[PDB]
């Protein structure tokens, strides 16, 4: 699921699933 | 940043994991 174009909520979802308990930062600029 | 790497071009795990805590 990560090796595609991911935008907006789809990107945030991928960071959530991959990062897990590590958390993450989303900085779209 | 993430949008240029993962939205306007094809994302990767390597790149996503740079944004994990």
mmCIF file of C-alpha atoms in Angstrom:
data_model
loop_
_atom_site.group_PDB
_atom_site.id
_atom_site.type_symbol
_atom_site.label_atom_id
_atom_site.label_comp_id
_atom_site.label_asym_id
_atom_site.label_seq_id
_atom_site.Cartn_x
_atom_site.Cartn_y
_atom_site.Cartn_z
ATOM 1 C CA UNK A 1 0.000 0.000 0.000
ATOM 2 C CA UNK A 2 2.935 2.463 0.422
ATOM 3 C CA UNK A 3 4.431 2.284 -3.062
ATOM 4 C CA UNK A 4 1.917 4.499 -4.846
ATOM 5 C CA UNK A 5 0.871 8.129 -4.999
ATOM 6 C CA UNK A 6 -0.559 9.027 -1.552
ATOM 7 C CA UNK A 7 -2.177 12.375 -0.987
ATOM 8 C CA UNK A 8 -4.032 14.109 1.841
ATOM 9 C CA UNK A 9 -5.887 11.675 4.141
ATOM 10 C CA UNK A 10 -4.462 8.754 2.152
ATOM 11 C CA UNK A 11 -0.959 9.841 3.081
ATOM 12 C CA UNK A 12 -1.793 10.455 6.682
ATOM 13 C CA UNK A 13 -3.320 6.926 6.821
ATOM 14 C CA UNK A 14 -0.143 5.396 5.426
ATOM 15 C CA UNK A 15 2.003 7.247 8.028
ATOM 16 C CA UNK A 16 -0.379 6.059 10.747
ATOM 17 C CA UNK A 17 -0.185 2.441 9.658
ATOM 18 C CA UNK A 18 3.543 2.306 9.045
ATOM 19 C CA UNK A 19 4.671 4.356 12.001
ATOM 20 C CA UNK A 20 2.444 2.746 14.620
ATOM 21 C CA UNK A 21 3.421 3.638 18.187
ATOM 22 C CA UNK A 22 6.370 5.599 17.018
ATOM 23 C CA UNK A 23 3.905 8.352 15.927
ATOM 24 C CA UNK A 24 4.750 10.674 13.090
ATOM 25 C CA UNK A 25 4.924 14.141 11.709
ATOM 26 C CA UNK A 26 2.874 15.300 8.700
ATOM 27 C CA UNK A 27 4.253 18.600 7.274
ATOM 28 C CA UNK A 28 2.753 19.217 3.890
ATOM 29 C CA UNK A 29 4.457 22.669 3.683
ATOM 30 C CA UNK B 1 9.070 17.460 1.556
ATOM 31 C CA UNK B 2 6.569 14.590 1.939
ATOM 32 C CA UNK B 3 4.047 15.844 -0.552
ATOM 33 C CA UNK B 4 6.626 16.134 -3.376
ATOM 34 C CA UNK B 5 8.057 12.666 -2.538
ATOM 35 C CA UNK B 6 4.828 10.764 -1.817
ATOM 36 C CA UNK B 7 1.843 12.579 -3.390
ATOM 37 C CA UNK B 8 3.171 14.109 -6.561
ATOM 38 C CA UNK B 9 5.549 11.265 -7.030
ATOM 39 C CA UNK B 10 5.434 7.657 -5.908
ATOM 40 C CA UNK B 11 5.899 7.148 -2.171
ATOM 41 C CA UNK B 12 8.201 4.557 -0.540
ATOM 42 C CA UNK B 13 8.570 2.986 2.856
ATOM 43 C CA UNK B 14 12.040 4.378 3.165
ATOM 44 C CA UNK B 15 10.673 7.840 2.801
ATOM 45 C CA UNK B 16 7.648 7.413 4.991
ATOM 46 C CA UNK B 17 9.698 6.084 7.836
ATOM 47 C CA UNK B 18 11.778 9.294 7.819
ATOM 48 C CA UNK B 19 8.646 10.902 9.193
ATOM 49 C CA UNK B 20 8.060 8.501 12.068
ATOM 50 C CA UNK B 21 8.986 9.481 15.600
#
